[PDB]
Amino acid sequence: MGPHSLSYFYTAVSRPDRGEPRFIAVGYVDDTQFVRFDSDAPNPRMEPRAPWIQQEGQDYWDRETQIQRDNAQTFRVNLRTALGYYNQSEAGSHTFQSMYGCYLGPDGLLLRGYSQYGYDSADYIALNEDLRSWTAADTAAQITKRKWEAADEAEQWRSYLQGLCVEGLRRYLEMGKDTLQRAEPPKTHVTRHPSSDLGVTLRCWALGFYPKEISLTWQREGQDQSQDMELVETRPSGDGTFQKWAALVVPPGEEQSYTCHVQHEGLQEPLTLRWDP
């Protein structure tokens, strides 16, 4: 099991001549969503989206709620400011995003951290690996970089990532240990689907695994077959786990020459499988 992380994802969208912008926030420990915020909800609050965070008292909900209401206002200002920087009209919808978080080392201290901002689906500004400096994607973002340098905003990020961020992560990991500190390995199988006199499809499935990281490959006696393999995007099961499959077309009668190979952090050893009716 790799290093654990705490991360947050914010989205604000402008709706012109149709009211003020919408602000959504979500929080995760690894791939497990544990909280949400939605500026459209009555008396909007940071809400639980996992069972183990409900333990937290009212003081934790009130503080987390207030921080998200302030963010929503800050992102509305940002959307306005960006129109000026890019000389854009009032007519169109625009999007402003942020993603940030921390990772926990084997010593129980900060391993690494990040903080990124994007405008209209493009990089805007990002905190560097050293947590002491910024990378601006273009001349507009350079204005922000100068402003945040003047305010030494990087120092405020570094102190959070080293302190409160990893403090919260350790709390969440202990509180939800039964689920968060447990890797669930994949349940695997191979299906066969005839196609023509030239080919039969072999599909290698991986089901019910957690976390989402996985490696699925096909080999023909030692040589990887990725070139014309169909590898779908990792997809949610709906219960907190993930699925994936990888398929290839092989000549009829040569199914036993192909093996599927699966690596995941929940497996004591990698798996090898084949079509075995």
């Binding site: 705490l6 947050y8 926030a25 929080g27 987390e64 921080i67 998200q68 302030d70 963010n71 800050t74 200002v77 940002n78 400011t81 960006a82 920087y85 942020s98 940030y100 903080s115 901002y117 805007y124 500004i125 922000t144 402003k147 945040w148 305010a151 905003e153 405020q156 990020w157 959070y160 409160l164 961020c165 403090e167 919260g168």
Partner: peptide, 9 residues
């Protein structure tokens, strides 16, 4: 625990 005071761009 979220970051407490985001700064405008």
């Amino acid at each position: 625990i979220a970051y407490e005071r985001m700064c405008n761009i």
